[PDB]
Amino acid sequence: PSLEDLLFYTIAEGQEKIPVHKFITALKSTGLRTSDPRLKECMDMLRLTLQTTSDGVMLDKDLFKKCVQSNIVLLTQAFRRKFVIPDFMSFTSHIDELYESAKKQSGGKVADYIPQLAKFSPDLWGVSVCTADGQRHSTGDTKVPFCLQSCVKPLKYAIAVNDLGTEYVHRYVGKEPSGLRFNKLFLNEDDKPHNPMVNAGAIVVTSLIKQGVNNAEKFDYVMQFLNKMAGNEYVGFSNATFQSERESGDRNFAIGYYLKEKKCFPEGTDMVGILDFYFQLCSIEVTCESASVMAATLANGGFCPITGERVLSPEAVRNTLSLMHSCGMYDFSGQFAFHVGLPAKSGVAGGILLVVPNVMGMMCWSPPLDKMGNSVKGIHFCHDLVSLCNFHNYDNLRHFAKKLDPRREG
Amino acid sequence: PSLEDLLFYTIAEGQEKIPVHKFITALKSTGLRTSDPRLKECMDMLRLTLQTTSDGVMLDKDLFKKCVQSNIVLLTQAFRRKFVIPDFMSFTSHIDELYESAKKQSGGKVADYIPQLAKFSPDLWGVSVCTADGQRHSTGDTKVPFCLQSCVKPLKYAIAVNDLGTEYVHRYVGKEPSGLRFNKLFLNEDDKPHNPMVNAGAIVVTSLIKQGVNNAEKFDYVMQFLNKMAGNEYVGFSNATFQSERESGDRNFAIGYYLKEKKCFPEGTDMVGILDFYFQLCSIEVTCESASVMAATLANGGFCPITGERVLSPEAVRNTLSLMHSCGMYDFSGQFAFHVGLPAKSGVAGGILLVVPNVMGMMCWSPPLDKMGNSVKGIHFCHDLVSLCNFHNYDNLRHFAKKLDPRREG
Amino acid sequence: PSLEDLLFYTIAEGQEKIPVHKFITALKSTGLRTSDPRLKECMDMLRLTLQTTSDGVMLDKDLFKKCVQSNIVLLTQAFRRKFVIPDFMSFTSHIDELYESAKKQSGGKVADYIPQLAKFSPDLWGVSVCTADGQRHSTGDTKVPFCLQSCVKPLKYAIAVNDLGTEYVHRYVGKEPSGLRFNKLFLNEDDKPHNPMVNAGAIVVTSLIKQGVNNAEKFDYVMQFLNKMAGNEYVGFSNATFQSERESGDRNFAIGYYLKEKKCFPEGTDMVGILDFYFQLCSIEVTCESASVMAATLANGGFCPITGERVLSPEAVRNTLSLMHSCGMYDFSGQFAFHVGLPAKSGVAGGILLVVPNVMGMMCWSPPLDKMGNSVKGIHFCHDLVSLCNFHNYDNLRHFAKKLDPRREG
Amino acid sequence: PSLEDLLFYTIAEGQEKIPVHKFITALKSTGLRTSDPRLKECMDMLRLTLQTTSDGVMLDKDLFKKCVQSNIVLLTQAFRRKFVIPDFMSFTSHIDELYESAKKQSGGKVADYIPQLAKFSPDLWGVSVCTADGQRHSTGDTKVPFCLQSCVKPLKYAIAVNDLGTEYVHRYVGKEPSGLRFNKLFLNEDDKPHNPMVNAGAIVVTSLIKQGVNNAEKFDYVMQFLNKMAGNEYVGFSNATFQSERESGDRNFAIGYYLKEKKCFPEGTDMVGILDFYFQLCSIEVTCESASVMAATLANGGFCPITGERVLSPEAVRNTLSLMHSCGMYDFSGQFAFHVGLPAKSGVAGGILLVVPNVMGMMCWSPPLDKMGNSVKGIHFCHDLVSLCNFHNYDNLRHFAKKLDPRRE
Ligand SMILES: O=C(Cc1ccccc1)Nc1nnc(O[C@@H]2CCN(c3nnc(NC(=O)Cc4ccccc4)s3)C2)s1
Ligand SMILES: O=C(Cc1ccccc1)Nc1nnc(O[C@@H]2CCN(c3nnc(NC(=O)Cc4ccccc4)s3)C2)s1
């Protein structure tokens, strides 16, 4: 008996050897990417044996075992259809029609707040999927960088809860939606911002991360933290929006000064500096692939799906998903929690960092926003997504009408 | 091969025949109860053949086989560990520990609004479980009748959505929590009550059920409905509470008139009569066992777990859980949604109607309310429950730290 | 070779005989209805031979031959997938999603002009399809009667051109849209109403049908036509609406008198009587199944698709479609012609008579009008339909980007 | 089995060889022209073997194969009568009678406003066809160059929507016909010109193409666009016409200043410069064969029929065909939309750029205009054409009286 041989004959045909063009397209059809970090060791050993004999792309029973032996447990669950979406290619084609049915919603206005965001083209539209098992798919402008803006608010909240714990973090920021009331107010009635997803609350959260060290070290700590959430995929920084958001942020300055008398920061806070750190964190750049992985990290209880590493404590992810449910889409949050039922977070660059817990993480991106600040195409996509699969938070995994459950086979 | 045979040797021990108490204790240890409605044919023939011969209580291979023949698909999931809680015996032992730690919380005040709820003892405390598969467990004062009071609000909202649909019903009622600055107002800014879980909204929803018939017919139409949600377990009516809620509903009479003014009911509504219907629906009686099956029907996508009949549409159940999530615990809702993450509804009688979607429904009952109107022991129980199992809506089903997952073996 | 046999083994499986439910579910899935008038002999002889032996139910090669013998030419085009939409099962599955996306549009207000249209519920919403070959599908409230109102204008225009020819009819009525300052004016500068689709023009056209005869026969002559256009499905008359349009038609009276000094009718016209006839023609009743067949006759060059009968001359059908293109949706006509590109007609009752030439006719109905008088749901549906298929008048039948073409296989 | 063999034997006679005149006249009778760009390799391989031995003009099955292998799938649908007009030879003979019945209509007066248009003879008259498959036919004066004038308005509108998209373009110009005495006003009540086919709208459209570059580069971008649209057939520039349109263009200046005041352009517009661009764009030269291919690109969903290239987005072609339907013939537009049912666009030079969607494009040219500005012969031809074939937009492709349908056998 052997796990490697059994997998060999499943791909082999009962034939003697496997061409390695056939092995990787068998692999790519599980949705995995040959660049998966949990597979380097297997593809490190395939570029090795694809120089030893440049003739015969072919692989014995025994040559197969020494390329895959290292990663075999992850490869067979991929090949025994044991990933969270077993027929991943069927699901991606649904992602495709979902992408392109959203593609003809030309409504919306791109943020003119800054010359750096009006800059971005209204025809950009990208959707990226990463499952809790690492299966990936993209369509549209999926590797164009854009800034997270307020899509970083759950990520910095998670970091704060991860390092400091729920109870401390919420001495300083609430945990409830304000109400379609106070788009306008900074503080709840305990003189705390309502929740980490609104600018007043985000700024307070930003004040908590890595106290006692300067703002350059603090920023690097969030960036290496954000690196782990993304499996070390792309996360950058556009100094252009950063310097443009510091010239044009009188209300963050309004909020900041509002927080000082009201003694909403912890002792020793340099508010004007924290405003700079906040402006930096909102100009962090990602793609939808990058961001989809961080989404999937939250989809996966704090484990990065493409590295297997523990990034965020489960307590941090639960809280972060809790509040993205209720507060994550500006004024549209309650409507969104009702009709979509997914923890999501939107940003002025056109991003929606969407999380389907226990299934997949996603990132949508189209710069045209509606009049509540949400990517028009993005909102459309998530409505269609829940309208077609039982990813809604309170769909039943047993009785779900004419919806699909991509989590199951036949 | 034939299931009744396969199941026969599973209990048989490899022995000759199965005594019927050995079969009955094996079944009850799966958590099913011999009175299960989906088991009635099987238990009708065990009582019959234990009259056909008053000696030897043992069961041949066909004597067993033609007693379970009608019900075999359910008995096998029961005996093959295929229910959603496979190790139900330890899970109830946890419910017991959970029950008894809430039992030493002597705080709270019993609602003295009317002599009928001040009548109730502060030492009454009951918790009842019913799973999406029909498994039951109770502890404490579990068959004492009490009125749902506002535990009926999700149930009548579901009924309304089932017959009229989301889009119609929500012409008349909102779908968001007010904000804990608006426990006080009746209407949001589209002049709709904020959501079905608050008195103004329940009252509007009640105005929608079964228009065109008188209040006696409406009441029975809702009552037959609650019978189906409860698998025909106890659903009653306390006329004592109803007549006393007719004296002391100046706020409801306030709300009713405020709503008729603002053109909030559908045309042709007799508001004062709807108020009478509303007081009726709030004085409908249950026990925790009755009501736990009621909750399990929403846990189960609208199928009553102990009868298999479809009671509520999936759209009705999803919306009802969506709004119990955010609006279900009066002012404690946002705190509840954060710390417990379970769709729940409380009532001034001491009830909390709790739903763990895809797993189980429950009803806890202790009349002493805290200063926000929620059962003290109930609130204590629900916090302990999710701190011990990954039932929180945004717990991860794969990575959940030191919590238990009763959905899996060990 | 023989045509009945060839169709026999195509369904037969090569097997036995054909169960007659298997023949009829095969027939219905082409979209035909067993009630089709061109199939009456086949279903008469199938109901007959399912009495000749009450106990079959199967079909010999010679028994199949004598049930389909009279109808074989139509059944083969149905079974050789030679109808204008070959995969009708796909297309109706799309129509359903189109219907359900329009169902969530709660905007609009029902015409309260007369108590007869305010009666109608805002949640009535029906869509019905009939192809140039007779294939049908409906969804929603498709056999609820409503009056054509101004959906009759294209039809009476067609009747007029069919009997009198283009050149005579347009002595009295123009053939161009007014332009959106002239919603308000009755006559162009040749002292003719602008076109047959606006009230002044219809009223003049009403004056041309069946001159020299009294109003009872005139109405009856139009009713014979509309029965023929609908294959004798439901077309009725609402005396309720007619008398209320008799009370509240000061404008048609205003218009009627304005048309009389300017000598706009033919000699010998009794203007007030013509106004009465026009009021009758507007309160004629249909359902969307009924009316969808009327649209399909215009889609089909004047032949009723479900009877094969020639109803309108090609000249009448072309002109009526020419003018529904530009003038058919009130103030929205030019926008509708741009974004939808289909000959359509709207009515105050909530109807939209839509024609996809050479393909199919449809009738959408939801009584809520927008602020220009067009069914909100109808307008929404018509956008999504063309946004989904290459039916736009000026889509290309070869290069049409990511749109669907139901005229094509795969 | 092999297609070059099959096509060889369908042409061959069943004899062993084909004279290559028999192959060329058989090819021209499908209506394709040996100059078709999609046949270039094929004619490269017979320009070559028509030197290997200069007499003995005949072709084996393997020699035939090595010239047509490169172009084989386009050549058989040509020879298996699978083009959208299978019997092109009768259709062109119908186009001929339509040409000659229209040629006897001398009504009209040549545009006399500028000397360069007075220059043109009243008896010049050309009609050229190009089908969605590349079949070509002409009659009369079909590569005498003349300016598009206002026949360019759909093309610059197509370019605009192709690069910028429908929603942007129609921020600045409407999408409906004005009303028959609103020929005189420049703006509707949203302060946009009514549509891209009227001068105010065209002038605004001209303001949208290729912003941020100077007017020499702008003009070159449009001509690269028109080159692709015509499959690189004739497109020129009459500097004579351009100088008469600038000396004598007071309404455009009126329009330009009226639009600038009402802020009808996008920010950063140089109005007097855009008027200059608009005047040159209107002096672009074509022939009827040239333009008929441009028409055929619009008949064909934005793909040029003689090169296979994707030129215009499908969204762009639909909108342009939409608006040529309702707004394309000046005051005669509504009448034309009723009786002809074809998207057409007329110009002061005497052109009518006509499109039969999914079938063919054509360009008519006779300089005598009627009293609404449309070529008399062009208008006559467009009436007779639909009077003969079910090309009317709302003709039925199934029940169509005695009109003939060249699309079927
Ligand atoms: O003008 C409108 C419009 C309007 C609409 C309908 C009716 C009337 C007016 N809206 C404004 N929004 N913000 C404004 O000014 C500043 C920025 C936000 N600031 C606040 N944060 N938190 C607050 N409240 C408490 O903290 C309660 C509290 C609870 C317990 C103790 C102390 C205070 S105010 C102050 S003005
Ligand atoms: O007890 C206090 C204490 C208090 C605390 C701090 C300062 C002093 C006093 N305050 C009261 N709260 N409620 C009261 O009773 C009234 C009956 C119901 N009323 C309303 N319901 N819903 C509404 N909706 C809109 O108003 C939206 C809307 C609609 C159109 C435009 C704008 C907004 S009004 C209010 S008294």
From Swiss-Prot, chain D:
UniProt keyword terms in alphabetical order: Acetylation, ANK repeat, Cataract, Cytoplasm, Disease variant, Epilepsy, Hydrolase, Mitochondrion, Phosphoprotein, Repeat, Transit peptide
EC identifiers of the protein: 3.5.1.2
**Activity regulation comment:** Isoform 1 and isoform 3 are activated by phosphate. Inhibited by BPTES. BPTES binds between subunits and favors dissociation of the tetramer into dimers. Inhibited by 6-diazo-5-oxo-L-norleucine (DON). Enzyme activity is stimulated by phosphorylation.
What are the N6-succinyllysine sites (modified residues) in this protein? 28
For this chain, one GO molecular function annotation is: glutaminase activity
Acetylation in keyword set? yes
Keyword Phosphoprotein included in the entry's annotation:
yes
GO cellular component assignments: cytosol; mitochondrial matrix; mitochondrion; synapse
Instruction: Mark the residues carrying the PTM N6-acetyllysine.
Output: 175
Region named Highly mobile activation loop: 179-186
Q: According to the UniProt record, what happens if one changes residue 186 to S?
A: No effect on catalytic activity. Loss of inhibition by BPTES
Q: What class of enzyme is it?
A: hydrolase
What is known to happen upon mutating residue 150 to A?
Answer: Loss of enzyme activity
Q: Which domain of life is it from?
A: Eukaryota
Catalytic activity field: L-glutamine + H2O = L-glutamate + NH4(+)
Q: Name one GO biological process term.
A: intracellular glutamate homeostasis
Entry comment describing in which tissues the protein is expressed: Isoform 1 and isoform 3 are detected in brain cortex. Isoform 3 is highly expressed in astrocytoma, ganglioglioma and ependymoma. Isoform 1 is highly expressed in brain and kidney, but not detected in liver. Isoform 3 is highly expressed in heart and pancreas, detected at lower levels in placenta, lung, pancreas and kidney, but is not detected in liver. Isoform 2 is expressed in cardiac and skeletal muscle.
Q: What does this protein do?
A: Catalyzes the first reaction in the primary pathway for the renal catabolism of glutamine. Plays a role in maintaining acid-base homeostasis. Regulates the levels of the neurotransmitter glutamate, the main excitatory neurotransmitter in the brain.
Q: Which family does it belong to?
A: Belongs to the glutaminase family.
Q: Which disease is it linked to?
A: Developmental and epileptic encephalopathy 71: A form of epileptic encephalopathy, a heterogeneous group of severe early-onset epilepsies characterized by refractory seizures, neurodevelopmental impairment, and poor prognosis. Development is normal prior to seizure onset, after which cognitive and motor delays become apparent. DEE71 is an autosomal recessive form with onset at birth. Death occurs in first weeks of life. CASGID syndrome: An autosomal dominant disease characterized by infantile-onset cataract, erythematic subcutaneous nodules, profound developmental delay, self-injurious behavior, and intracerebral glutamate excess. Histopathologic analysis of skin lesions show deep perivascular and periglandular lymphohistiocytic infiltrates and pronounced leukocytoclasia at the surface of the dermis, focal vacuolar alterations, hyperkeratosis, and parakeratosis of the epidermis.
UniProt domain comment:
The C-terminal ANK repeats prevent the assembly of the supra-tetrameric filaments.
Under the subunit heading, UniProt states: Homotetramer, dimer of dimers. The tetramers can assemble into rod-like oligomers (in vitro), but the physiological significance of this is not clear. Interacts with RAF1 and MAP2K2. Interacts with ATCAY; the interaction is direct and may control GLS localization, negatively regulating its activity.
The name on file for this protein is: Glutaminase kidney isoform, mitochondrial
What lineage, starting at the top, does this entry show? Answer: Eukaryota, Metazoa, Chordata, Craniata, Vertebrata
* Covered residues, full protein: 137 to 545 of 669
